[PDB]
Amino acid sequence: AMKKVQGIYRAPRQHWVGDGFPVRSMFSYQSHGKQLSPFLLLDYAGPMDFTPTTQRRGVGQHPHRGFETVTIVYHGEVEHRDSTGNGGIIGPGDVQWMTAGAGILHEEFHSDAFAQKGGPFEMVQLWVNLPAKDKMTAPGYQAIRREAIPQVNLPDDAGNLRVIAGEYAGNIGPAKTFSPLNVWDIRLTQGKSCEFSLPAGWNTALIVLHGTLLVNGDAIAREAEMVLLDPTGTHLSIEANNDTVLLLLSGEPIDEPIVGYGPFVMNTQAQIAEAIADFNGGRFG
Ligand SMILES: [Cl-]
Ligand SMILES: [Fe+3]
């Protein structure tokens, strides 16, 4: 049975987050919290060509509690830091999987080397919800190098698929997750197709970053457009009308309340009050 298309969304207008992240917001939990669980948010930064500068372009220090932050870099370099000292630089092909859990205080910005040279800048920011029993887990980092991400060639020379989280054809993703989910990065060659088998009941989305994609032989998605699929079903097929780049997100739904405000995503409104109180009380970190 097919995971049939139940919603397709046009490219959103771009807004600026800080001075370093020109993003198009694909979805958020306010409107797609139940339908996209475990995924809370997807921003698509760029593509943008940045000029050399002495500025440190990025976003200021800000808190997070109750979920995980995933940064997938395609072009450019970003550096992340937190008030603890946990830091690092994410370059092309690299992934950072950040667990905010109990609470974190961090900032993201263009790396010092990217500031000097400029050039293409493109990446995805994804938020992954935590089960209630884990929403206060210790904050943790996972700097995932491009080399450590399996790259599986697709049958019929259709393209390749990077297994960031989950599993595909026996190749296991390096991302450590708290609940069952897949995060795949797919290049599909024009004229080629591929059919996938996913777990029944898993919420599934396709986000097209480049190209023209025909989903289940019906809907067509292009740059910055998103297909939301029926979670009831185990199958889907994609075809590349042009050389395509897409993200495939799929996960077992977290059947728990979502109460979120800005940087805090918890289970109860009382937990959001506690979160804001901790942050303004200086107890956050
Ligand atoms: Cl500086
Ligand atoms: Fe952040």
Whole-number Å distance, alpha carbon 69 to ligand 2 midpoint, is 7
- Using DSSP bridges, classify how beta strands 119-129 and 159-165 pair: parallel, antiparallel or unpaired: unpaired
Q: Closest Cα partner for 144 from 87, 85, 93?
A: 93
Whole-number Å distance, alpha carbon 172 to ligand 2 midpoint, is 26
Structure-determination approach: X-ray
Residue with tokens 């480049």: 210
Torsion (CA) 159, 165, 166, 168 in degrees, nearest 10: 10
Torsion (CA) 251, 169, 142, 56 in degrees, nearest 10: -90
Report d(CA 24, CA 42) in Å as an integer. 9
Tell me the residue type at 83: S
Whole-number Å distance, alpha carbon 87 to ligand 2 midpoint, is 12
Residues 6+ apart with CB under 8 A from 282: none
Mapped onto helix, strand or coil, the DSSP state of residue 112 is helix
Whole-number Å distance, alpha carbon 128 to ligand 2 midpoint, is 13
Quoted resolution (Å): 1.7
Whole-number Å distance, alpha carbon 81 to ligand 1 midpoint, is 13
Residues 6+ apart with CB under 8 A from 149: 93, 95, 162, 163, 164, 173, 174, 185
Whole-number Å distance, alpha carbon 30 to ligand 1 midpoint, is 35
DSSP 114: H
Report d(CA 168, CA 197) in Å as an integer. 10
Q: Which ligand is nearest to the CA of 81?
A: 2
Report d(CA 64, CA 165) in Å as an integer. 21
Give the environment of ion ligand 1: residues with CB less than 5 A: 56
Report d(CA 72, CA 70) in Å as an integer. 7
Question: Known binding site: residues?
Answer: 62, 64, 106, 108
As a whole number of Å, the end-to-end CA separation of the chain is 46
Report d(CA 130, CA 177) in Å as an integer. 9
DSSP 102: T
